[PDB]
């Protein structure tokens, strides 16, 4: 069970995996606790590798401390970061739009070198944003998640290349540092090795060794075997170490004198002065592993070294020499091979702690520049650490990371699953990551070092395929950023329980077998020839002794959102991709019933998503409500879990939390106590269970279209709540200040009935499109009046009414009730921006029922819009008179290759009507492999087939023969799975039985009311006079180039002339068209578009005389 | 936060472009130092300055 | 050829424009980097938006307000220097810079 | 140093601000920054006004003035395919239903004025400037009509009484 | 290759003295607006920065020649003016692009025509059209083919 | 070494085989389509390509 | 299609005949090298860097040494550059 309040979901699992699913937000939480250096991280860092427990801030400060001047005569050195309490709790910050912060404090110490003093202060380093309980950040009230990023680890990357002009291998090596300088040793088309430092020219490597002062004799002694190094030894044409140093300086610098010592220090400065070259701890560990340069000494001295350079060059020449291994003098031997830049040994994961540490460090760079600009200039024995330190670049750097970066994303939540999979998500495009314009299609591809470390199914389906992935279920991140994976080691056929986490290189060291293998629960693989995974990705039947690692489970390769797909092993990977994507786009309904057929990964994925209130300590419920559960802990204390009623999510959905426990129950430590948005008794529930039929019904379910019963509309089965926010401010102007007030100029009184006495509408008023929400007027000024307007004002006695109404009107196509109005005032001492008096937000909510056009999808990528909501009478009903609910299409099933939906449908009917396999004449044959307490099941009992320990189609076939009758003696669904569907429309039975069953389908977030749009005349653009774009404004559809080619290919010249002149840019022509249409005249002749005149003025401004001529 | 409503600092008042009668205007033929002549249409009741930035 | 471009063209002769052509194009030599006055939010004299060069910001309005009617069309205020005309000419009047 | 600072204050920002205002802006920024260090909190504008011996309205005017303009070409979208210039509604443009509404209002007003007599419609058009945009006054109207300005005032009072009837007002009330 | 451009100059009446330049034209201000947003957050269309740079450096050069200055200062000023006009006509062409705040390259005159973002493929050929609309489709199996 | 149109290459030759006959000679080429559409007559088409 | 409409010289450029007659098929040093025997005769055109990674053209069997070919028959296997076949076999 493993969770004390779980609903009993009887599983079809035949295996028994030892490692339970981890704390799925660990990839966020443990990384951030590493950044803080909290004691909960410190004990786990004392668990292994306890010699250096250092936080993120401690590491940044230790590479910052000390900071000395140009002379070194005064040194300021930081120490000991510290955190206060948070300035405000989470819900208060989410209300008042404050960012969830906590103040830093750094014990900064200044030393004077000449006289000798300490200056120990406590510098306020800045208000620092902190991760919430659930893994997210809160920035200015909105909720933000920093998404992890894949980059290649800095190291030495040996590789070979081929040439069609040579037909020979050309090796290379790219020593990549972090923020240092690249360098390469590439064998050219001839047999010459050449140093390319900082992308300079060819420059043979014996010159570089002489720049290290290495003699030609020392090269000969080092490379006596090396033929190409010998040829470049004799072919160097420069002897004398400084004679090579000036050559290096002249190639790299040019525009500077030789001045030998300046060239002498430069090569030391460029690679070994560590304030300009820092391959990280990851870099030093990776390099020392790659060349075997270190036996057991710890990872320190993050600059480069001459021993590493000579080992690099020796490794390159032995790689070109066809060597297989190489020992280095003074280190362990290593194999000789190229390196793949897509292998997950060579691709680390810059998680959230690493990212914010990088941003803090680049803030500290400009802070240190400001310090050393300040420390030398100001007087000595007057400064203090408060004087020298300007924290403004640090706090500005963190704020410009959290706001406004391509990684700190607006946290997408319209179900708990999209939140969960929007964390733990691997991203591959950022600063220093690959852009799309430079994106190579090799990085798009999976390759067999993703097994357990990434999910090949789940990825975006647009143009960002393969870049954005997702973490696996069981994955874990090493302290260097490499991605672990748990394996059960097997010692000589005895599958142990020493669950050893393994990274990619160590996975390549050994061989790895599969969990779906015959095991007698004593180790002891029954088959000697077992499936196994070699290092390069090979699959061989190795005898069952050399197997030294087993998988922890099946479904280890898969993500979280894909592990909720039932019958995954029957789908194609494209449609499983679409199912895994569109499981993250369900909207939360108002009832949210748990699925009949599921997997094991719903309960754990909901209680780890944070959108279920979980009882912390065990006890008895003192009191329930809709707003709070006051629990009573067993030792005296009580605690109230406040609800979150009708919160608006970041994409405008429901966020209700009704309690599920009663007024006197007992709860345990970890029990689900409150079902969130998409939950039901704790487990995940994104859609409803629906009776399905797979016949093509009358052409309405044509080409992925879905028809529905009217029962879904009538019984509110599919009904989402959508909560939209509107807001307006009241800021000052040159003419005074804007005034939220009930009195609006030139307005009637029936629209001013919704408003209260001071502006805003009353809570509970149903508004339509175009109604007043906040009566707000501005001072307009004094303009001259047209004489017609003047004499009409003289006739009707109305004054000029010098204020101009620009009120907040609820825009087109939006309606519904008004939930709540939060008004912030400058007079009420709130935190408004400068010069803004009254800020007021209005939350309009509606109850979007289902309709035609709304996108629906099952859990297998079988998506489709709603074709036609039939009435409940003319819908095909069974012999029982139960009408089916939706009707799918047949031709969508086979040619898309997902009969996972058909197996889910058959198993849904079995779990719905319930079964009892008669073990009276013994247990039958298929049921023997089937576990116990599944031979009989009550109707509407939930089951669970996990992802790869699935349902076994033979056993499902045996199940469908042995289901139990509904209410009468009546078996609706035969052994094949097809019922005798009568027709609702005409009334005769359909002449062939039709597959029916129960199916899980979700309401997707692509509803029509968000998508419909129309504009006859709206706004216009500024520079060119085109109409605008997008549903937020009015905008018109982009009549692009391909539409223009289609209109030309018809030969329709006149329509193209209309579309390109008098509907966009003929600025007199627009009002002439409007006037002639309303008056009923002919459409006038078009003129010259405005965008052409703009082009003409641009070409004239580029000193091109562009005249235009008649004759 | 806002609705992105732009407005350049200018006033638009739509009257009819009438051309039958206007205000009567003289013409001043200014001359620069480098032999360059320019014409400014000034009104009748209008003090014409001796110099002008052309 | 055309200056308001009524729809009868045959050719669009591009050509490398000379200094005489550019200083014949323009309506005034802008000689000040001041874009818009910081307080009154009106275009400056001789600035990059200067109404003396490019035309009036308000329809039939000189800068000093002395002329404001359609009847005063095509004349220039003898103090503020702006030709009182339509405000759409600021789409279509170029300036130049004497290097 | 002085010429560098004077040139910096003159040629830094786009909307040019004269040097005393930039001096007090930098004084405000320096004082607010020092209070952010020492006080450890971004202070209230009234506190900054008290610190700089001025009024909080002056502080808010200065904080309004220090806001440098933004670029019309910066990428508005997260996907780098849209600029800020593509999302600005031109409120200065023609609403394109007000033009046909105003022309129809001119037609209805001309019909309603043509219900009147020649002296009445002439007096109304010359009083409100329908013919030229410059509304002449009562003495000029009586001069072109040969009568007193007071007779013209009587006629204008009579026509404004006539026009206020709903028989003329029913098709004009809906135009506001 | 040289006779191409030399015969092209000889054929027309183009004088080749227009490749040097003496009077830089100014694009009219409604094409480079400073539009006030709702709240005074102004928005310049980024040509005004390049024009301000050129105007600044030219006025300073004119002041320097009026002052009487050594050759190094005048030559440095004229090189600065030359690089400013280069940035105006095509920023990022010769060496380092003139960046804006936040390291954004300033959109010069040539960048209004170059690329997909240029005036040609974005606003001249394809235009946004009024009397338009958009919705998700459903199948209409009772309609006739012209409906 | 220049590419001119065949409709022009023949008709200009008719203008020059008259008034003293010297035949401008040439071979047909197979120009690529981006090389073709950029070396077109009307510059306004190729400026937008 | 794109390398054809752009009229680029292709990657798998198999040279063709230039005149009728037999041939000098010869496997040189790790790549083929082909001289064409005319029938007039005249200048025997030689093709030098024909890579032996390519394969000879099989037609009607492989190309024999001294096999009589056409004016513009494709000699190796690959894709003939259309700049050549325009020059060899005229614009038709
Ligand atoms: Zn004026």
UniProtKB/Swiss-Prot annotation, chain B:
Coiled coil: none annotated. It comes from the Bacteria. Binds to RNA polymerase (RNAP), stimulating transcription from principal, but not alternative sigma factor promoters. Forms a complex with the RNAP catalytic core and with free principal sigma factors. Belongs to the RNA polymerase-binding protein RbpA family. This is RNA polymerase-binding protein RbpA.
From Swiss-Prot, chain D:
GO terms for biological process: DNA-templated transcription initiation. Keywords: Cytoplasm, DNA-binding, Sigma factor, Transcription, Transcription regulation. Residues 112-165 are annotated as: Sigma-70 factor domain-4. It comes from the Bacteria. It is found in: Cytoplasm. GO terms for cellular component: cytoplasm. Its main location: cytoplasm. Residues 23-99 are annotated as: Sigma-70 factor domain-3. Residues 138-157 bind DNA. One of its GO terms (molecular function) is DNA binding. Belongs to the sigma-70 factor family. RpoD/SigA subfamily. Sigma factors are initiation factors that promote the attachment of RNA polymerase to specific initiation sites and are then released. This sigma factor is the primary sigma factor during exponential growth. The sigma-70 factor domain-2 mediates sequence-specific interaction with the -10 element in promoter DNA, and plays an important role in melting the double-stranded DNA and the formation of the transcription bubble. The sigma-70 factor domain-2 mediates interaction with the RNA polymerase subunits RpoB and RpoC. Interacts transiently with the RNA polymerase catalytic core formed by RpoA, RpoB, RpoC and RpoZ (2 alpha, 1 beta, 1 beta' and 1 omega subunit) to form the RNA polymerase holoenzyme that can initiate transcription. This is RNA polymerase sigma factor SigA. It comes from Mycobacterium tuberculosis (strain CDC 1551 / Oshkosh).
Curated annotation (Swiss-Prot), chain E:
The RNAP catalytic core consists of 2 alpha, 1 beta, 1 beta' and 1 omega subunit. When a sigma factor is associated with the core the holoenzyme is formed, which can initiate transcription. Belongs to the RNA polymerase beta' chain family. DNA-dependent RNA polymerase catalyzes the transcription of DNA into RNA using the four ribonucleoside triphosphates as substrates. This is DNA-directed RNA polymerase subunit beta'. It comes from Mycobacterium tuberculosis (strain ATCC 25177 / H37Ra). The gene is rpoC.
